[PDB]
């Protein structure tokens, strides 16, 4: 595949840095023909196969091919792709409202009901992806962003498709990648991967959202990975005293070692913490609250 060969500067004015990755810088940009704003993600090509100073073409093409297919309110879309001698440049939907957790940490309080309204949008974005056999594989709080934080109901946008893969029937995918505190045991243990890893990651996100504690984070990388592999976590009363039983059950069904026994996205949407079956369930959720003092501390990390 060949992407657009023109100088991106002919079509866009580039602005400030929005963020960066190992081999990527993301800048705000303005499309000259429309005056509309986008995010330009400049990915460094490795260029020579023996160089470790950039991304392989296969990995860039994969990210691009996944982003091209996706069209859903809770995931970013690809607008255009350009390339020059050094870079592949992805013009992405601009997400301007920062990370979800930073926005939530500015609130005075947050009930589980209010928390689930945000979580539900993540679940909807992932439901979409999984419906197309796309595993995101890098779900973590920093990849959960807000389109615009200054509206009454902020919209979640899942970003960062640098690790995403189409799950292809007939060919096993195994790899070790991603951030130790957020990856599933099958990633840790180099076992067959699928849509299930994302579900684990959602359990981790939810655990942090409610408590301000990371379920598996140890004092070293090696220790974090051992916690994940052993499914060594607790609902510490210091953090979870005001957390509903339905919320803990939601989490418990996601933080499951065997991928085949873990809750699927479709089941997570029907879980009573997400979709209460009666008045009593809806009342618990409303009555329960995020641990805001502790949560605010997490977001500061
Ligand atoms: N569509 C976007 N809108 C606004 N900021 C973005 C967008 N995509 C990425 N960023 C910012 O740039 C950072 C790096 O982008 P990301 O896609 O995460 O790169 P990588 O896959 O190399 O980690 C992100 O953490 C985020 O802060
Ligand atoms: Mg990233």
Curated annotation (Swiss-Prot):
Record PTM Phosphoserine, positions in chain: 288
Expressing tissues: Isoform 2 is expressed in normal intestinal tissue as well as in colorectal carcinomas.
Modification comment: Ubiquitinated by the BCR(KLHL20) E3 ubiquitin ligase complex, leading to its degradation by the proteasome.
Active site per UniProt: 138
Record-annotated Protein kinase domain positions: 12-274
Autoinhibitory domain, as annotated region: 291-300
Domain of life: Eukaryota
Residues holding ATP: 18-26, 41, 93-95, 99, 160
Induction record: Up-regulated following treatment with IFNG/IFN-gamma.
Its job: Calcium/calmodulin-dependent serine/threonine kinase involved in multiple cellular signaling pathways that trigger cell survival, apoptosis, and autophagy. Regulates both type I apoptotic and type II autophagic cell deaths signal, depending on the cellular setting. The former is caspase-dependent, while the latter is caspase-independent and is characterized by the accumulation of autophagic vesicles. Phosphorylates PIN1 resulting in inhibition of its catalytic activity, nuclear localization, and cellular function. Phosphorylates TPM1, enhancing stress fiber formation in endothelial cells.
UniProt note: domains: The autoinhibitory domain sterically blocks the substrate peptide-binding site by making both hydrophobic and electrostatic contacts with the kinase core.
Family named by the database record: Belongs to the protein kinase superfamily. CAMK Ser/Thr protein kinase family. DAP kinase subfamily.
The protein's assembly and partners: Interacts with KLHL20. Interacts (via death domain) with MAPK1 and MAPK3. Interacts with MAP1B (via N-terminus). Interacts with PRKD1 in an oxidative stress-regulated manner. Interacts with PIN1, PDCD6, BECN1, TSC2 and STX1A. Interacts (via kinase domain) with DAPK3 (via kinase domain). Interacts with GRINB. Interacts (via death domain) with UNC5B (via death domain). Interacts with UNC5C (via death domain).
Name of this chain's protein: Death-associated protein kinase 1
Species: Homo sapiens
Residues of the full protein shown: 2 to 302 of 1430
